[PDB]
Amino acid sequence: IALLLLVIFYVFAVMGTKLFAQSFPEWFGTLGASMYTLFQVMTLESWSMGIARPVIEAYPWAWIYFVSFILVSSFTVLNLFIGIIIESMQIEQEQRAHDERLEMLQLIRDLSSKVDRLERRSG
Amino acid sequence: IALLLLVIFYVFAVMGTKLFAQSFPEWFGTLGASMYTLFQVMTLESWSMGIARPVIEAYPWAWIYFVSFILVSSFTVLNLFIGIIIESMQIEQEQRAHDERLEMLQLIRDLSSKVDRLERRSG
Amino acid sequence: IALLLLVIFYVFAVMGTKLFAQSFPEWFGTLGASMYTLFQVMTLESWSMGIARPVIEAYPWAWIYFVSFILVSSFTVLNLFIGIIIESMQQEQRAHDERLEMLQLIRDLSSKVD
Amino acid sequence: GIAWIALLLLVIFYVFAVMGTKLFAQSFPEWFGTLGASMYTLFQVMTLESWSMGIARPVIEAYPWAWIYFVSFILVSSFTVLNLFIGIIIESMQIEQEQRAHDERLEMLQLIRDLSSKVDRLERR
Numbered sequence: 001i002a003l004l005l006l007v008i009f010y011v012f013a014v015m016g017t018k019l020f021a022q023s024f025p026e027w028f029g030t031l032g033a034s035m036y037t038l039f040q041v042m043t044l045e046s047w048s049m050g051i052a053r054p055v056i057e058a059y060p061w062a063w064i065y066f067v068s069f070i071l072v073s074s075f076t077v078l079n080l081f082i083g084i085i086i087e088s089m090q091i092e093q094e095q096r097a098h099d100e101r102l103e104m105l106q107l108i109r110d111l112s113s114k115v116d117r118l119e120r121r122s123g
Numbered sequence: 124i125a126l127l128l129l130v131i132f133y134v135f136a137v138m139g140t141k142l143f144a145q146s147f148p149e150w151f152g153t154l155g156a157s158m159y160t161l162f163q164v165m166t167l168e169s170w171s172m173g174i175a176r177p178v179i180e181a182y183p184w185a186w187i188y189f190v191s192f193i194l195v196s197s198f199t200v201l202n203l204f205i206g207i208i209i210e211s212m213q214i215e216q217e218q219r220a221h222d223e224r225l226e227m228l229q230l231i232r233d234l235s236s237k238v239d240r241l242e243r244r245s246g
Numbered sequence: 247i248a249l250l251l252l253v254i255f256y257v258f259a260v261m262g263t264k265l266f267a268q269s270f271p272e273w274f275g276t277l278g279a280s281m282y283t284l285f286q287v288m289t290l291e292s293w294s295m296g297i298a299r300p301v302i303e304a305y306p307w308a309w310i311y312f313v314s315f316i317l318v319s320s321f322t323v324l325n326l327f328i329g330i331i332i333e334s335m336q337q338e339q340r341a342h343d344e345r346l347e348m349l350q351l352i353r354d355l356s357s358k359v360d
Numbered sequence: 361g362i363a364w365i366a367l368l369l370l371v372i373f374y375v376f377a378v379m380g381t382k383l384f385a386q387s388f389p390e391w392f393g394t395l396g397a398s399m400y401t402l403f404q405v406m407t408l409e410s411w412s413m414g415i416a417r418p419v420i421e422a423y424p425w426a427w428i429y430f431v432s433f434i435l436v437s438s439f440t441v442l443n444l445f446i447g448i449i450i451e452s453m454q455i456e457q458e459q460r461a462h463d464e465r466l467e468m469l470q471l472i473r474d475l476s477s478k479v480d481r482l483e484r485r
Contacts, residue, residue, distance in 0.1 A: 036412075036416075036417075036427075036431075039431065040412045043408050043411075043412070043434070044166050044167060044168050044408060045168050045169075045291075045408055045409050045410055045411055045412060045413070046168060046169050046292075046410055046412065046413035046414075047166075047168055048159070048163045048166070048168060048169065048173075049168070049169040049173040050169070050412075050413045052159075053159075063159075067159070067162065070166070078204070078207070081442065081446075082207055082208060082211070084442065084446055085208060085446055085449060086211055086212065088446075088450060089212070089213070089450060089453070093458065094216070097220075097461065097465070098223075100462075100465050100466075100469075101220075101223050101224075101227075101465070102223075104223075104227060104465070104468060104469060105223070105226075105227060105230065107469065107472060107476075108227075108230055108231070108234070108472070109230070111234070111472070111475075111476050111479065112230065112233075112234045112237070114476075114479065114480075115234060115237055115238060115241070115479065116237065116241075118241065118483065119237060119240070119241035119244060122241065122244045122245070167289050167290060167291050168291050168292075168409075169291060169292055169410075170289075170291055171282075171286045171289070171291060171292065171296075172291070172292040172296045173292075175282075176282075186282075190282075190285065193289070201327065201330070205327075205330055205331060208331060209331075209334065209335065212335075213335070217337045220337070220341070221344075224341070224344045224345075224348070225344075227344075227348060228344070228347075228348060228351065231348075231351050231352070231355070232351075234355070235351070235355050238355060238358050239358075242358060245485075290407055290408065290409050291409055291410075292409060292410050293407075293409055294400075294404045294407075294409060294410060294414070295409070295410035295413075295414040296410070298400075309400075313400070313403065316407075324445070324448070328448060328449065328452070331449065332452065332453070335453075338457070341461070342464070345464045345465075345468060348468060349467075349468060349471055352471055352472065352475055353471075355475065356474075356475045356478055359482075360482060360485075
């Protein structure tokens with residue numbers, strides 16, 4: 001997920017950087033902006049009024065790129081969120097209940113061969 | 124829920140589009156704004172200061188439409204969020220704890236018949 | 247919780263309304279702003295840059311009122327959130343009936359005594 | 361250790377209130393003079409609202425040092441927000457069962473060891 005997110009975060013930093021470096025360099029020159037910017041947009045604050053709507057005055061191409069990135073980041077945010085919910089709830093103390101029962105018996109098999117030792121002790 | 128949300132998202136894109144296309148076309152001409160806009164307002168960023176308060180300088184009709192949409196979207200956001208919390212939680216190796224205990228005893232019954240058998244095998 | 251929240255939402259709509267109606271009526275004249283405003287601040291959007299920081303140029307009294315309201319609303323938001331998590335989450339005695347005469351058996355084998 | 365992150369967070373909240381206060385008090389006193397701003401500010405930035413357009417980007421016109429300080433603080437606060445959030449999810453999902461299955465099996469055997477010493481004890485025959 002973190003591996004997977006640092007694909008999305010990385011990929012779209014290369015998408016919008018290669019695209020809007022010509023026109024929107026304040027926001028998308030290189031990663032002195034695109035790494036911040038995508039964090040800023042992932043962080044749902046003045047991302048439309050500050051960035052997306054202004055971008056889409058020039059390029060309606062970015063119509064989805066923003067939207068998808070955010071939809072995609074909010075799907076993989078959730079997955080991380082719930083990725084710890086499931087991981088630390090309920091292999092622990094049930095593989096120490098065979099290590100008692102596997103020689104609960106074993107003990108007996110060498111008692112039963114020690115009764116059969118004085119079963120064999122008549123003849 | 125996703126089916127249900129793409130009703131709300133769709134319905135209110137038709138509400139505000141049919142309404143504010145006359146006066147507020149920057150935000151509500153057609154779905155070149157209303158699909159974004161509702162996403163933008165659902166995304167709790169410059170949604171009041173950028174949109175709602177300015178809208179309600181002209182139309183106090185939208186007083187609820189915004190609010191309801193958001194209240195409704197935050198109820199159906201939660202439902203999706205918790206919709207996965209319950210679904211992926213919350214009979215296995217307990218039918219191999221009788222297969223040890225069913226001859227834990229069995230063993231003994233042929234030891235006890237070997238105390239009863241070869242104690243009589245005794246003086 | 248909903249009953250409890252519509253205290254907080256209501257109470258602070260009466261706090262900031264009775265206070266800033268003199269100076270900040272655009273945001274806090276009556277409930278044509280204070281019910282919205284508190285929803286707007288509860289909704290963590292331009293709430294500081296648009297509202298709080300500007301409010302506190304005049305009144306440093308509101309220093310907490312905003313903060314507390316939000317801290318309080320985020321505590322009672324959580325409680326609602328988790329209030330549904332818990333609400334919709336809806337071999338033992340045959341392993342003593344083997345072990346209670348696993349032994350018993352033995353006690354009448356061990357009483358195999360001269 | 362269920363509400364022990366609060367101790368840990370009031371380190372981060374405190375530490376970075378001292379970071380940015382000692383730094384930007386010279387240039388950005390509206391936001392970072394002392395804790396009449398830095399305690400609020402960090403709450404404001406932790407609260408993901410106008411934090412870039414209002415604060416971070418403007419700060420980084422003067423100081424590109426704060427490039428991380430903001431980012432880290434937020435990354436760090438969103439990791440310790442989550443931990444608190446999920447810190448209550450697990451804590452209130454509430455028990456005898458399995459410490460009474462060793463109290464039978466620990467003398468299931470014990471019994472036997474004094475039976476085996478009572479087979480062995482009358483082996484002198």
